[PDB]
Design a protein around this ligand. Structure first.
Ligand code: NGA
Ligand code: NGA
Ligand code: NGA
Ligand code: NGA
Lengths: 146, 146
């Protein structure tokens, strides 16, 4: 089931992991350009959604407020999770927000092109990334409206 | 996770529900045109896949062998599950095959446009249809190779 509380188009938010409490950032300098962060609020943690239509209905591009780049999640080349300019020019720029089967208040950030979800953990490196496999709690996210 | 054993493009198969053992049929006359059936093998139970590309990567159109129509699954209008001429003109003609979380050999027939899965049951009417909500075993299918 699609997450029932997806922010309206253009509404700004942070993406915060339910369990770690870390947020995603998307920047243009100093790789990794997309990663998780535990610290003060920076503008590169702010996102809006571009609503997919037609073949992209129920998918969304995740766009950076300060730099305008959208996220991608792929398995073909490094970096696997990154950003790129535009408004979702490429297939792997498009994400589905899938409500958790148990916790109705959180969702997975799912990529149709790559069949992956984003995760945030405190355990094994890489501590942030994408993943194809079983459901784990470290794949659960919140929209944090600002 | 996408079902790892999706038939090659153009290969013929039946869609049989794991629990009821009923198969889907798709015909042009006598409604319901798409429904479940408990009985002998007939041509209107035979399907092939059109492989989606580009924005439809990891999605598939399900085409009927004897009549050439593709399936649809929608919540907008009755019939909710049906067929239509073409090769996938509409977004509700496009399906993802999502492996079950527990049973690696079965999958849900998921529609991105409508956020529904197909089900087959012996209990309440309608005994075949689509559904937006929790995971139930009556939503599990096999590709039956012919
Ligand atoms: C002083 C400095 O570089 N701090 C960076 C900041 O620029 C921002 O990218 C943040 C993630 O929101 O990560 C921090 O490590
Ligand atoms: C053994 C191990 O590292 N397991 C992790 C699992 O805990 C979870 O983090 C998942 C990503 O959601 O990735 C797996 O590789
Ligand atoms: C005008 C209208 O309703 N168009 C629908 C279309 O949206 C789609 O549901 C299709 C089945 O793939 O059936 C059509 O009748
Ligand atoms: C309350 C109720 O009847 N729930 C059913 C559920 O058991 C299952 O059959 C599902 C289809 O997967 O449809 C639901 O309407």
């Amino acid at each position: 089931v699609n997450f029932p509380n997806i922010p309206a188009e253009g509404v700004q938010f942070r993406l915060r992991a339910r369990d770690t409490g870390y947020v995603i950032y998307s920047r243009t300098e100093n790789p990794p350009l997309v990663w998780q962060y535990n610290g003060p609020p920076y503008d590169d943690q702010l996102f809006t959604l571009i609503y997919g239509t037609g073949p992209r209905k129920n998918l969304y591009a995740i766009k950076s407020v300060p730099n305008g780049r959208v996220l991608f999640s792929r398995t073909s080349a490094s970096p696997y999770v990154g950003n790129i300019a535009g408004d979702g020019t490429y297939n792997d720029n498009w994400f589905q927000f899938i409500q958790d089967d148990n916790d109705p208040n959180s969702f997975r950030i799912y990529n149709l092109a790559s069949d992956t979800v984003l995760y945030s953990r405190t355990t094994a490196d890489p501590k942030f990334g994408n993943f194809t496999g079983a459901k784990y709690d470290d794949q659960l996210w919140h929209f944090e409206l600002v």
